[PDB]
Write a protein that binds this ligand. Structure first.
Ligand SMILES: *[C@@H]1O[C@H](CO)[C@@H](O)[C@H](O)[C@H]1NC(C)=O
Ligand SMILES: *[C@@H]1O[C@H](CO)[C@@H](O)[C@H](O)[C@H]1NC(C)=O
Ligand SMILES: *[C@@H]1O[C@H](CO)[C@@H](O)[C@H](O)[C@H]1NC(C)=O
Lengths: 13, 182, 185
């Protein structure tokens, strides 16, 4: 099985 | 926040200058793996686990790239407030009960690390050790500082005494934590 | 000097996947600026630095984040932690040693070293001639070696007399039957 990482969101410039 | 278990899937830390980044997975406080940003591989602490589960390193790289991105944006937002250097505190203790002649492992637990840049080395009879040394990644702490552990394989004897040398920006001089068997 | 950014996700599980809570912290150096807490349901600004983020993320990433409670937390627990972390069983080694050099009828301390075990749940008891010791037992905290094993030291304040049998009694999930070690004066 495959592990999934919690996504980090990119802030707006 | 209480619970039976806790998984941190994707702790992402980035630091500047130097372009220093770290991406790890922790389960119940232990290190599942870290992604080698340079070699671009998932490095599992317990190699057997890599046989039953897998993580695509790209996810690691990607999250780091974003960490970098949010660092600039946040540095600007604070009007370039630098990180305060903390004084790391080390503790040395044996893995197993000390027995003359029985192979063992000395553990150097360093807490309150910040920022996440440090050198943890071993001295045997005041001389630097190279072989038999291994180290973990930085683990997160509730206060957002980190902890790290270094390992030295050794055999307890009458003549050998040891030191865990910690060198950090928050320390005026490298600190030595002494340890000798009984 | 330098500047640090930390992104720390947390999947809190209770009774397996019966209750999963997802907390995501965004931190600058050591200040948490914006946090997503599934108990709350949306992103929130912890400090002023987080407003530019909370506002926007609740519009474009709210549902995607909430769904991670299933796509990441639950998925990992059931498909990857299950056959590894949750299946790991390491038996404790138990050995007794005396603190001070022996001399009958003189106070001393027995040290029961319970080491190299996983998971953390463990019970360590001291017995003196078949009776369980309580008040004179002291213990260290559970020590995390950092290599997926723990260790703990349980001491017993005692006075070695002839004929006495001191027993360190350890119960752990990796063991069908308790491990006991005796020490006789
Ligand atoms: C940053 O600098 C601006 C421009 O002078 C100032 O108005 C603002 O209050 C400062 N904010 C912080 C968080 O330092
Ligand atoms: C760590 O070791 C390297 C190489 O010896 C050195 O250049 C650096 O200044 C040391 N200290 C820290 C805090 O990294
Ligand atoms: C967890 O397990 C049971 C059955 O799944 C559940 O109904 C209950 O809330 C929990 N019980 C305990 C003792 O934790």
């Amino acid at each position: 099985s495959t592990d999934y990482g919690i996504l980090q969101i990119n802030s707006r410039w | 926040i209480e619970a039976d278990h806790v998984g941190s899937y994707g702790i992402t830390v980035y630091q500047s200058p130097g372009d220093i980044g770290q991406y790890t997975f922790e389960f119940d406080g232990d290190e599942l793996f870290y992604v080698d940003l340079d070699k671009k591989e998932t490095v599992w602490m317990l190699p057997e686990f890599a046989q039953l589960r897998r993580f695509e390193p790209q996810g690691g790289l990607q999250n780091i790239a974003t960490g970098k991105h949010n660092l600039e944006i946040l540095t600007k937002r604070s009007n370039s407030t630098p990180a305060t250097n903390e004084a790391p505190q080390a503790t040395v203790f044996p893995k197993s009960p000390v027995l003359l002649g029985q192979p063992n492992t000395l553990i150097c637990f360093v807490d309150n690390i910040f920022p996440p840049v440090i050198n943890i080395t071993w001295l045997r009879n005041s001389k630097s050790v190279t072989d038999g040394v291994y180290e973990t990644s930085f683990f997160v702490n509730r206060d957002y500082s980190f902890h790290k552990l270094s390992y030295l394989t050794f055999i307890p004897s009458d003549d050998d005494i040891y030191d865990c040398k910690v060198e950090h920006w928050g320390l005026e001089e490298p600190v030595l934590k002494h340890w000798e068997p009984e | 000097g330098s500047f640090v950014h930390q992104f720390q996700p947390f999947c809190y599980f209770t009774n397996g996947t019966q209750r999963i809570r997802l907390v995501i912290r965004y931190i600058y150096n050591r200040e948490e600026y914006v946090r997503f807490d599934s108990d709350v349901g949306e992103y929130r600004a912890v400090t002023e630095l987080g407003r530019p983020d909370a506002e926007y993320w609740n519009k474009q990433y709210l549902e995607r984040t909430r769904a991670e409670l299933d796509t990441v937390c639950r998925h990992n627990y059931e498909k990857t932690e299950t056959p590894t972390s949750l299946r790991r069983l390491e038996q404790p080694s138990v050995v007794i040693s005396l603190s001070r050099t022996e001399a009958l009828n003189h106070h001393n301390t027995l040290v029961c070293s319970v080491t190299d075990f996983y998971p953390a749940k463990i019970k360590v008891r001291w017995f003196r001639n078949g009776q369980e010791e309580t008040v004179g037992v002291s213990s260290t905290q559970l020590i995390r070696n950092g290599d997926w094993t723990f260790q703990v030291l349980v001491m017993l304040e005692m006075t070695p007399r002839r004929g006495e049998v001191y027993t360190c009694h350890v119960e752990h999930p990796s063991l069908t039957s308790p491990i006991t070690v005796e020490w006789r004066a």
